[PDB]
Scaffold this active site. Structure first.
Site, PDB file in Angstrom:
ATOM      1  N   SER A   1       0.818  -1.333  -0.113  1.00  0.00           N
ATOM      2  CA  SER A   1       0.149  -0.071  -0.093  1.00  0.00           C
ATOM      3  C   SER A   1       0.780   1.207   0.020  1.00  0.00           C
ATOM      4  O   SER A   1       0.535   2.198  -0.626  1.00  0.00           O
ATOM      5  CB  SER A   1      -0.966   0.061   1.068  1.00  0.00           C
ATOM      6  OG  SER A   1      -2.218  -0.631   1.002  1.00  0.00           O
TER       7      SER A   1
ATOM      8  N   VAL B   1       0.746  -3.722   4.331  1.00  0.00           N
ATOM      9  CA  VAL B   1       0.770  -4.976   5.150  1.00  0.00           C
ATOM     10  C   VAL B   1       2.066  -5.883   5.437  1.00  0.00           C
ATOM     11  O   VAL B   1       1.764  -6.864   5.965  1.00  0.00           O
ATOM     12  CB  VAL B   1      -0.408  -5.921   4.632  1.00  0.00           C
ATOM     13  CG1 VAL B   1      -1.801  -5.002   4.452  1.00  0.00           C
ATOM     14  CG2 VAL B   1      -0.237  -6.299   3.168  1.00  0.00           C
TER      15      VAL B   1
ATOM     16  N   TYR C   1      -7.713   6.008   6.778  1.00  0.00           N
ATOM     17  CA  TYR C   1      -9.279   5.437   6.533  1.00  0.00           C
ATOM     18  C   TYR C   1     -10.224   6.211   7.431  1.00  0.00           C
ATOM     19  O   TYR C   1     -10.043   7.313   7.545  1.00  0.00           O
ATOM     20  CB  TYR C   1      -9.303   3.743   6.521  1.00  0.00           C
ATOM     21  CG  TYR C   1      -8.167   3.057   6.037  1.00  0.00           C
ATOM     22  CD1 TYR C   1      -6.946   2.791   6.159  1.00  0.00           C
ATOM     23  CD2 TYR C   1      -8.625   2.618   4.491  1.00  0.00           C
ATOM     24  CE1 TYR C   1      -6.266   1.982   5.579  1.00  0.00           C
ATOM     25  CE2 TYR C   1      -7.582   2.109   3.556  1.00  0.00           C
ATOM     26  CZ  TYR C   1      -6.407   1.924   4.117  1.00  0.00           C
ATOM     27  OH  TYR C   1      -5.495   1.079   3.541  1.00  0.00           O
TER      28      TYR C   1
ATOM     29  N   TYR D   1      -0.745  -4.070 -10.693  1.00  0.00           N
ATOM     30  CA  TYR D   1      -1.013  -3.336  -9.233  1.00  0.00           C
ATOM     31  C   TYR D   1      -0.386  -4.316  -8.202  1.00  0.00           C
ATOM     32  O   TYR D   1       0.299  -3.820  -7.450  1.00  0.00           O
ATOM     33  CB  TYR D   1      -2.543  -3.229  -8.941  1.00  0.00           C
ATOM     34  CG  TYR D   1      -2.880  -2.785  -7.531  1.00  0.00           C
ATOM     35  CD1 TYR D   1      -2.258  -1.908  -6.738  1.00  0.00           C
ATOM     36  CD2 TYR D   1      -3.412  -4.027  -6.829  1.00  0.00           C
ATOM     37  CE1 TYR D   1      -2.774  -1.667  -5.496  1.00  0.00           C
ATOM     38  CE2 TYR D   1      -3.688  -3.818  -5.281  1.00  0.00           C
ATOM     39  CZ  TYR D   1      -3.351  -2.387  -4.869  1.00  0.00           C
ATOM     40  OH  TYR D   1      -3.229  -2.362  -3.275  1.00  0.00           O
TER      41      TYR D   1
ATOM     42  N   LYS E   1       1.134   3.301  -3.236  1.00  0.00           N
ATOM     43  CA  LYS E   1      -0.135   3.981  -3.624  1.00  0.00           C
ATOM     44  C   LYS E   1       0.295   5.324  -4.007  1.00  0.00           C
ATOM     45  O   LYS E   1      -0.115   5.969  -4.903  1.00  0.00           O
ATOM     46  CB  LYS E   1      -1.196   3.868  -2.860  1.00  0.00           C
ATOM     47  CG  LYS E   1      -1.902   2.353  -3.146  1.00  0.00           C
ATOM     48  CD  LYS E   1      -2.932   1.973  -2.162  1.00  0.00           C
ATOM     49  CE  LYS E   1      -3.614   0.765  -2.319  1.00  0.00           C
ATOM     50  NZ  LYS E   1      -4.492   0.143  -1.094  1.00  0.00           N
TER      51      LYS E   1
END
Ligand SMILES: N[C@@H](CCC(=O)O)C(=O)O
Ligand SMILES: N[C@@H](CCC(=O)O)C(=O)O
Lengths: 450, 450
Positions: free
Chosen positions: A64, A261, A243, A191, A67
C-alpha cells in the site's frame, strides 16, 4: 560528538521493542511466514541527512505504501483532469460499497484504497500504453525518488496473484462502471507487481522526503515532481491514509502517513521530514502496530505535528541597516508567501510616502495592543518577527534627520523563492520606485526573475 | 508605498463579488432577513499585522465558528481526559445517527457538529458550575482571543430559542446516554447564546491567528492558550470543519476552517495566518458560498496550503565563522525541532572527535548523491539548508591547520525556542564539552533554560 537524533531512534527501538503485539499479514502465505522479530526506523531530512536505527536496511514489499507514488506519476502523465475523473478525494474504509461508484462521479473514493489504486494504475502512461510500459512506469517513479533502481519480488507477486479474488472483484466492478478500460486481469496483475516492489526503511524515508520538500530530491537538489503534484499526494495521505481513523490520527499524531501490510510505514511531513518505519506485525485494523506507535512517539517527543507551525516568518529579513541616506535590506532562507509577506512589511515600514497608514485597529479600543506595539522589539520576539522591526527603526530616529533615497536588496543569503515570492517582492519593488526611491537589487546568482 | 496584500484583498472582493449565489440561513427569521449584499475579508498575521477589505467591520453572530473556541476552553478547564470522554475525534455529517453514541464510547463524533458542541458547553467550567458561569466562560474565551469584551445578540438568541427543537432533540439524546448532566433546556440555552456572540470579520481573523501561532496573541505576545490545546483545536477544524467534504477541502484549499450560518468563516493556518471572511449567502451544503471560495482563492494564489511547507530549516543557523582556534556559531528565528535539528547538524559537522561518521548511504551505490554532496553550497541552496554548511567549511581547509578548542553559541538573534529545542540544543552542548571542547553560551535575554 555523535549526532543525538539516531541515539533517540535507538532508544525508541529498544523501548517500544520490549513487546510485539499483533500478527503478520495472514492472507498471503509469503508474508504470514515472514520473520516478526524485526523493527527498524529511518528519518530523511529536507537538507539531505539520514538518521536510522534497528533493521532499517531490510527489504520488504512496499504494498500500500506504493499508492501515493503511482498517484503522483499518474498526475504527471495524464494531468489532474483525466485522473480526478477516475479517482475521488473522500476518505473511507477499505470495505467496498458499490454505492460509491453509482454517484454521478462514477469513481472510487480515493487513491489510498485498493479500488482507487487500481484506477491509478490503469491511467499510468497513456490510453495506448501496454501492460509492460505501465508496470515499469510504476517501478520507475518509485525508483527515481528512492534514488536507485528497484526490483519486483516475483515470489510475493505469484503468491498474491494466486489469491487475488478480492482485487479482481474490485477491478471487474470498476470496469462495469467504465473506470478501467483494459481487462480486470491485466490491471490487477500490474497493481500486484506494483505492490511487490522491494524497499527498505531507508528507501521510504528518502522517498517520503521527496514529497515533504514539495518534490525536490534531498540528496541531489533536482526536482523529481512538481510541487503541485506532491501537495495533492500528501493531502490525500493525511485525509485517507488511515481510513476512518484519519480524524483520530491527525489529532494524536499529525503526520501524513500510509502503512503497508508487509510491515512498512511511509511518512512525509511537509517542510520537515520523510519517515520510514518497519515492523511486520499488524494491529487489529491492518497497520504496522509498532510502525504507527513509533510515529506517535516522534510526534509527541518532538512535536513533529502538522498542526505545530514551523514558519520562516520575519526571519526572511536577515537585517535592516540604515547606513545613512541609503538603507540595506538583506534577505535569507526559502522565501514563499511567509517570508515575502514579512518582506512587504519591512519595505512598507519605511516612510517612502506620506505615512497615513491604516492601523487596522482602533488604538482607543485596544489600549493593550498599543502598549505592546510601543515596544516592537519585545513583541517581535514574542511572536517571531525576525529583523523586520529594524525597518521601523531605520525609519525611526534616523529619519528625523534625512530622507531615504536608495534601497539595496541583497538576496545572496536567500536559498530559493517560489513564484509567489517573486511576484510579491517584485511588486513591492515596483511600488518603491514609484515613491521616487532608488532600488538596486544585488542578486549574485540570478534568482529573482520568473 | 502601500502594502500590496490589502490591494489583493480588494481585487478579490470585487472579482468574486461580481455574483452572489445561494441563500441566507432560512431556519431562523432574523438571519433569513439579514442583508445579503455584504462581503468582507481580513487576514491577521502571526507578527501582529491586519489586512482587510470590503465589509470587514460589520458584526454578525459567530454561530458554528464559536465551536473551536469553547472546545479550547473546555480542554483548559477540565483537561483532555474529561473532555475526550464526552467528545470524539471522527469526522461526520451534521445529520445525526443514534448509532454514534451506542459505541462503547457513548459520545458524539467531534466538537464541530452540534451534538458535540452541546457536550463541550456542558463541560465548560466544572461539574458544579451554574448556567451563568458557563455562559460567560464561553463569552470570556472568545473575548480574550478577540482582544475585547464581546456581547451576545439576544435578538438572535430569542429568535433561535423559539425554534430550537432540533438541538433540544440532540441535547435530550445526549442526556439519555449520560453525556449531559444538567437539563436539555439549560444546555441548549447556553449553546444558543454562545452562537449569538457578535464578531466582525476582523475579530475572527485575530481569533484565528491566536490558534495559528499555537496560542500566542499576535497583538501582544502573551500566551492565551497552551500550544497543545491549540494543536487539538486546529486538528479537529481540518478533519471535521467541512464535514464529509473535508477530504476534498483539505486537497483543494488546505486551510483549517469553519463556517457559520450567519455568513462568517474562520480560518487558521498554523505558523502563517488567521482568516476571517464574511458573506451572508450559503451554498447547497450550508457554508458561506463566497466565504469558502475566497479561501480557495487565497490558497491557489498564495499557496497558503497546509501541505505547502514553510519551515525555518537550516536558516536557524545564521552563520558559522572559524575565526581561528575558536568557532562562532550564531542562531536565529523561532527554534523548534526544525531548527534544533539543523543546529545539531552544524555542531556535529565540526571534527570534535575521530570523524568516523555514518554516511547513512553507500557512496558506491549512489554515485549521484556523492557528486551532489561534493558541492555542499549548491545542494544547500537547492533544499534550503541556510548556513549550516559553513560548519563543514570551518572544519574544512581551516582544520588542516589547528584544532577547534572553543565554541561560542550566540542566541541574541533567536526569538524563542520550545522545550524540544532547548533539550536538543542542550544535549548537543553536553556532547561538545565531552569532546574536550570549551563551550560558552552568549544568551543576553536568558532563553536557553527550561
Ligand atoms: N497488496 C495488498 C495491499 C496491502 C496493503 O494494504 O498494504 C492488496 O490487497
Ligand atoms: N446556531 C446553529 C448553528 C449554525 C452553524 O452551523 O453555523 C444551530 O443549529
Amino acid at each position: 560528538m555523535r549526532h543525538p537524533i539516531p541515539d533517540y531512534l535507538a532508544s525508541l527501538v529498544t523501548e517500544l521493542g520490549a513487546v510485539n503485539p499483533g500478527e503478520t499479514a495472514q492472507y498471503i502465505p509469503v508474508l504470514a511466514e515472514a520473520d516478526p522479530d524485526r523493527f527498524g526506523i529511518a528519518l530523511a531530512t529536507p537538507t539531505g541527512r539520514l538518521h536510522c536505527a534497528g533493521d532499517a536496511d531490510v527489504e520488504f514489499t512496499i504494498q500500500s505504501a506504493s499508492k501515493p507514488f503511482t498517484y503522483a506519476a499518474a498526475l504527471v502523465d495524464r494531468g489532474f483532469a483525466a485522473v480526478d475523473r477516475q479517482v475521488g478525494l473522500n476518505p473511507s474504509g477499505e470495505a467496498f460499497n458499490e454505492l460509491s461508484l453509482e454517484a454521478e462521479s462514477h469513481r472510487p473514493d480515493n487513491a489510498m484504497i485498493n479500488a482507487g489504486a487500481l484506477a491509478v494504475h490503469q491511467l499510468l502512461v497513456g490510453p495506448e500504453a501496454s501492460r509492460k510500459e505501465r508496470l515499469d512506469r510504476a517501478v520507475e517513479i518509485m525508483s527515481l525518488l528512492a534514488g536507485r533502481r528497484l526490483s519486483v519480488d516475483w515470489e510475493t507477486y505469484e503468491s498474491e496473484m494466486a489469491v487475488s479474488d478480492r482485487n479482481l472483484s474490485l477491478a471487474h466492478m470498476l470496469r462495469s462502471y467504465g473506470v478501467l478500460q483494459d481487462s480486470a486481469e491485466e490491471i490487477v496483475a500490474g497493481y500486484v507487481a506494483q505492490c511487490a516492489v522491494l524497499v527498505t526503511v531507508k528507501d521510504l524515508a528518502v522517498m517520503g522526503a521527496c514529497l515533504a520538500t514539495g518534490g525536490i530530491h534531498p540528496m541531489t537538489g533536482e526536482r523529481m515532481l512538481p510541487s503541485i503534484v506532491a501537495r495533492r499526494v500528501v493531502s490525500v495521505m493525511t485525509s485517507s491514509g488511515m481510513y476512518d481513523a484519519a480524524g483520530q490520527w491527525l489529532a494524536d499524531v499529525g503526520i501524513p502517513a500510509k502503512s503497508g501490510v508487509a510491515g512498512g510505514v511511509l511518512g512525509a511531513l511537509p517542510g520537515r521530514v520523510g519517515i520510514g518505519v518497519f515492523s511486520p506485525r499488524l494491529d487489529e485494523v491492518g497497520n504496522s502496530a509498532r510502525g504507527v506507535l513509533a510515529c506517535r512517539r516522534l510526534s509527541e517527543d518532538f512535536r513533529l505535528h502538522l498542526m505545530d507551525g514551523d514558519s520562516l516568518g520575519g526571519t526572511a529579513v536577515r537585517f535592516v541597516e540604515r547606513e545613512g541616506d541609503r538603507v540595506f535590506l538583506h534577505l535569507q532562507g526559502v522565501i514563499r508567501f511567509g517570508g515575502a509577506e514579512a518582506v512587504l512589511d519591512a519595505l512598507t515600514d519605511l516612510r517612502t510616502g506620506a505615512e497615513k497608514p491604516g492601523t487596522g485597529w482602533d488604538a482607543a479600543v485596544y489600549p493593550r495592543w498599543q502598549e505592546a506595539a510601543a515596544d516592537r522589539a519585545a513583541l517581535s520576539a514574542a511572536t517571531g518577527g525576525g529583523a523586520v522591526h529594524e525597518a521601523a527603526a531605520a525609519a525611526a530616529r534616523d529619519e528625523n534627520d534625512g530622507p531615504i533615497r536608495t534601497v539595496v536588496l541583497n538576496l545572496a543569503r536567500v536559498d530559493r523563492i517560489d513564484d509567489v515570492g517573486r511576484r510579491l517582492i517584485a511588486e513591492g519593488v515596483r511600488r518603491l520606485q514609484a515613491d521616487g526611491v532608488r532600488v538596486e537589487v544585488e542578486d549574485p546568482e540570478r534568482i529573482l526573475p520568473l
